[PDB]
Design a protein around this nucleic acid. Sequence first.
RNA 1: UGAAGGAC
Length: 91
Amino acid sequence: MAPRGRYGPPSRRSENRVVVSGLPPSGSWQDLKDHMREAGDVCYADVYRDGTGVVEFVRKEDMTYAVRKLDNTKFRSHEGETAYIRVKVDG
RNA sequence: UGAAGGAC
């Protein structure tokens, strides 16, 4: 998606970010959108390969919704396993 | 996170 082969804003940018912690080592930015889609129209995510990452939606209200209904609930990844996530406000 | 995105 609109690559540049160099450092910079990855692909979808944001406005209303929230952390996603407790994530399995299987997680990635690609799978975070494929699941927070429940909370709303997530458009960007980022991952730190260490059990933490971030995600954002087209509307800031869908974000606080993702850390009140999609916090402390199941999440899934391409590796074939699942774990809870502890969404946070941002950091 | 050696530098970005659909990676599988």
